[PDB]
Amino acid sequence: ELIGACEFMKDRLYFATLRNRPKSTINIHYFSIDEELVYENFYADFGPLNLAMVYRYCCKLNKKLKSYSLSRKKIVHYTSFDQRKRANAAFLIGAYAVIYLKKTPEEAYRALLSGSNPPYLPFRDASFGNCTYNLTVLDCLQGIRKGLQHGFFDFETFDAEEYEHYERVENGDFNWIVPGKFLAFSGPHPKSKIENGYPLHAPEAYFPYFKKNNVTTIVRLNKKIYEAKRFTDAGFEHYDLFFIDGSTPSDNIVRRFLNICENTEGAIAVHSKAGLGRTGTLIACYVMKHYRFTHAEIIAWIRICRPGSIIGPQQHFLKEKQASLWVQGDIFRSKLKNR
Amino acid sequence: ELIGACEFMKDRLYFATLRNRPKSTINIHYFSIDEELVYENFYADFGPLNLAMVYRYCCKLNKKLKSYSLSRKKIVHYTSFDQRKRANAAFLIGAYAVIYLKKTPEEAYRALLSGSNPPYLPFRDASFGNCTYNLTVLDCLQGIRKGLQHGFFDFETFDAEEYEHYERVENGDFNWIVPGKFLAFSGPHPKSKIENGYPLHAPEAYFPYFKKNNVTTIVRLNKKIYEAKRFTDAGFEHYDLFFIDGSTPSDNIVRRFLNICENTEGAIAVHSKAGLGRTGTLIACYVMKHYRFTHAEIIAWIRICRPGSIIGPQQHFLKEKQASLWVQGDIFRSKLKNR
Amino acid sequence: ASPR
């Protein structure tokens, strides 16, 4: 009877791993999200679930915990022995514990290890290889805590419909990474059109949203297939900082990106081809410098906002650059005692 | 004084660009290699100086820095306002800084730009074209670092006399590109001889050195002018992967070259007509796939080993194929059964 | 385009 389950609220909230579907009783309400909140994969990546799915889980669970009909029951979030579903499910209840139960990531992860349960499978990147860089559930909970600490999301105001609308390719495939500062998107094409059923967006499709949300600057990181002047004519600044798909940026490119972003007060729309690897890597450099995220925290946060971001050697790159970016950030913030 | 000189060791080692040959003073020792270490050009290529010349420079400078009579002087490596000499001289002191002063390529390049001096001219290829691909001094230093990182050379054991012996056409015109793995040479001829001064070498001339150095396999990429039987009968394996002089290799030729080399035990001797363009291009494909050299890094490394390698469109080919080759490397490693 |  709930043997091996992880206790998150005493005699009230549990997380369980179950081979077969349980049966709710007069004493226990079971629910699973494994078929409801489903990760959309690129290759063999399987999580973490994105920010809107974290939000939907917390909504679902808060409703259950306030419900009259369940008020007398133990609530059990269960998952299956599919370890990729189980990692995501553990991430969700851990994130709830951080956001709504005021536990630290360490306390939440300790609860997830409460029973005698097997370890949680680390998350992998969207690349075709294996090994490399393992992003654990704990890393993802640390990234949630840091995002919350610096106000990168607020579930009192989060607009899931907007997130789920604009993440789609038909609506421009973008996600905010840092509210009011960073939007990540896939690179516009020279003409808005459909091509083999795939929708293509010209730069002009973005002007209304960009203007309304204070996007002053476009940074392009991939090969040129549209004229930059189409943006600059419309009043946006535009910058090119090309580097090769799947590679790591030169010091000069990182330096130039940081100066561009530090010298505008508005938001920056950053794209590459998919807007995943190269875009995520340079945004992470800014966030590590100016908010002192660790490499694991920022890879987690950016992937929670925009799945598949930061790929292959870019992951180890952020770990190698962390110490220097943190120093640059301290030096930056010291020259600000007086602006 | 020393206005505009680049400091490499505090109050001790500098790099200067000077219109006229200065005179060593009682405080300052001046030396130049512009007429001592001279690049042998194919066409309009002018550098980078080969690995034996890097070595000779480093020996020379280490001796000056250990001399008692010079111990109280500033040592100043100077070059002229010939920008092709100056680029090689900057490459040499930067390479010394990487190998012996433990500077990063970026730190060495920062020192090279520290003074008040124009930029450094990028190296061009050995083709008749006008330059289309800029191989920078920093690229070359990155190539030095990667070669050091993966043990492609070691100046504790490097034999410069042997390098400079076998590079000569009378002694076989070959250079090692990856120790124990790749040897690049110009194509053998049907009969050994000396035709119009230029000596020609038959397959059998190479049998001793190959056998002694675990060369098991020959790959030919140019027109046939000798029977593959002459190598196979001697116990060597021999492969033909012809593609047109000056062309870029097809997907099929790349895949086959890589198959051969990945399933080959010993060292592989690769040749085309000159052993430069087609030969350098395919060897680079392997090194990019399996060691994750960038295009610039491998073009630099192979040219430092074997000047004139990788020509015209082959340069841009390697840049255009980098992302793909790195991915092929990840896929290759994802199928391994090691440990 | 190999040298000669």
Which CATH number belongs to the domain containing residue A298 in this structure? 3.90.190.10
Signed CA dihedral, A213, A219, A222, A227: sign only: positive
Q: Identify the domain containing residue A24 by its residue range.
A: 6-149
Please give the residue of chain C at the shortest CA–CA distance from B272.
C2
Please indicate whether, in this complex, the C-beta atoms of B126 and C3 are within 8 angstroms of each other.
yes
Q: Identify whether A154 is part of a domain.
A: no
Q: How many residues does chain B have?
A: 339
Contact (CB<8Å) C2/B311: yes
Cross-chain Cβ contact B326/A247 below 8 Å: yes
Give the CA-trace dihedral at B73, B76, B77, B83, to 10 degrees.
-170
Question: For residue C3, which residues of chain B lie inside 8 Å, CB to CB?
Answer: 42-43, 126, 274, 276, 308
Residue linked to tokens 């280490």: B62
Does A339 reside within a domain?
A: no
10 Å Cβ neighbour count for B40? 10
Beta strands A174-178; A182-186: pairing state: antiparallel
Tell me the residue ranges of DSSP E strands in chain B: 6-9, 13-17, 28-31, 74-79, 174-178, 182-186, 193-195, 198-200, 215-220, 237-240, 267-272
> Are the C-beta atoms of B294 and A313 separated by less than 8 Å?
no
Amino acid at A301: W
* In a shared domain, residues B208 and B85: no
Neighbours of B285 (CB within 10 A): 25
Cα–Cα distance measured from residue A6 to residue A28, given in angstroms and rounded to the nearest whole number: 14
Exposure string over A45-62, b if 16+ CB within 10 A, otherwise e = bbbbbbbbbbbbbbebbe
Binary contact (B245, C4; C-beta < 8 A): no
Q: In this structure, what is the dihedral angle of CA atoms B324, B329, B334, B337, given to the nearest 10 degrees?
A: 160
Chain B, residues 107-126, CB within 8 A of chain C, namely 126
Q: Which of B299-303's residues contact partners 24+ apart within 8 Å by CB, and which partners?
A: B299/B133, B299/B135, B299/B139, B299/B143, B300/B48, B300/B135, B300/B139, B300/B140, B300/B142, B300/B143, B300/B144, B301/B143, B301/B144, B301/B146, B301/B147, B301/B152, B301/B177, B302/B177, B302/B184, B303/B48, B303/B123, B303/B135
| Residue A156 included in any domain | no
**Helix, coil or strand: residue B44:** coil
* Strands A74-79 and A174-178, sheet pairing: unpaired
CA atoms within 13 A on the CB side of B97: 29
Q: What is the token pair recorded at A83?
A: 């370890």
According to the entry, how was the structure determined?
X-ray
Residue B283 · residue B254 · CB < 8 Å: no
**Residue A157 resides in a domain:** no
- For helices A277-291 and A251-262, the axis angle rounded to 10 degrees is 60
Distance CA A7, CA A21 (A): 19
C and B touch per CB criterion (3+ pairs under 8 A)? yes
Q: Check contact A-C (3+ Cβ pairs < 8 Å).
A: no
Note whether A213 and A109 are same-domain residues: no
- Asked whether the beta carbons of A290 and A320 are under 8 A apart, the reply is no
Q: How far apart are CA A209 and CA A230, in angstroms?
A: 16
Bridge partners for B78 per DSSP: B16
What whole-number distance in Å separates Cα of residue B167 and Cα of residue B305? 10
SS (H, E, C) B77-122: EEECCCHHHHHHHHHHHHHHHHHCCCCCHHHHHHHHCCCCCCCCCC
Closest CA to B140 of B44, B15, B54: B54
Owner of token pair 């090689």:
B88
Q: Is B159 on the interface with A (CB under 8 A)?
A: no
Amino acid sitting at position A36: E
Facing A128 at nearest CB: one of B292, B294, B334: B334
Token pair for residue A235? 């009043």
Virtual CA dihedral for A273, A276, A277, A282, nearest 10 degrees?
Answer: 100
**Strand boundaries in B171-288, DSSP class E:** 174-178, 182-186, 193-195, 198-200, 215-220, 237-240, 267-272
Establish if B148 belongs to a structural domain.
Answer: no
Backbone phi, psi, residue B40, to 5°: -95, 110
Q: Does residue B119 sit at the A interface (CB-CB below 8 Å)?
A: no
Which residues in chain B have Cβ-Cβ distances shorter than 8 Å to A247?
294, 322-323, 326
- Please answer whether residues B187 and B272 qualify as being in contact, where contact means their C-beta atoms are separated by less than 8 angstroms: yes
Q: How far is CA A248 from the centre of its chain?
A: 20
Resolution (angstroms) equals 1.6
Residues A191 and A84 in one domain: no
Q: How far is CA A190 from the centre of its chain?
A: 29
Is residue A67 domain-shared with residue A215, that is, in the same domain?
no
Residues A187, A93 within the same domain:
no
Enumerate residues 293 to 322 of chain A having a beta carbon within 8 A of any beta carbon in chain B.
312-313
Query: Measured between CB atoms, does B127 come within 8 Å of chain C?
Result: yes
Q: Is residue A175 domain-shared with residue A42, that is, in the same domain?
A: no
Separation CA A17–CA A155 (nearest Å): 27
Interatomic CA distance for residues A226 and A243, integer angstroms:
17
Question: What six digits make up the tokens of B146?
Answer: 């990667």
Contact C4 B308 (CB under 8 A): no
Q: Are residues B17 and B89 in the same domain?
A: yes
Domain annotation covers residue B138: no
Same domain? B166 vs B114: no
Within a domain: A1:
no
Final residue before a domain boundary, out of B119, B142, B173: B119
State whether B246 and C1 contact (CB < 8 Å). yes
DSSP code for A206: G
A24 plus A103 within the same structural domain:
yes
* Tokens linked to A53: 């799915």
Q: Tell me if A246 and B294 make a contact (CB, 8 A cut-off).
A: no
- Give chain B positions within 8 Å (CB) of A312: 326, 330
**What single string gives the DSSP state of each residue in A87-100?**
HHHHHHHHHHHHHT
Q: Are residues A55 and A125 in the same domain?
A: yes
Which residues in chain B are immediately followed by a break of C to N over 2.5 Å?
none
Are A56 and A129 found together in one domain? Answer: yes
Residue B241 corresponds to which amino acid? L
- β-strand partners of A76: A14, A30
Look up residue B109 and give its two tokens. Answer: 């390049």
Whether residues B186 and B295 share a domain: the answer is yes
The residue among A62, A47, A201 whose CA lies nearest residue A124 is A47
Q: Are C1 and B42 a contacting pair at CB < 8 A?
A: no
The chains in contact with chain B, meaning 3 or more Cβ pairs closer than 8 Å, are: A, C
Number of independent structural domains in chain B? 2
Pick the last residue of a domain from A117, A149, A181: A149
Answer yes or no: are the C-beta atoms of A314 and A163 closer than 8 Å. Answer: no
Final residue belonging to a domain, choices B101, B119, B137: B119
Within-domain flag for A302? yes
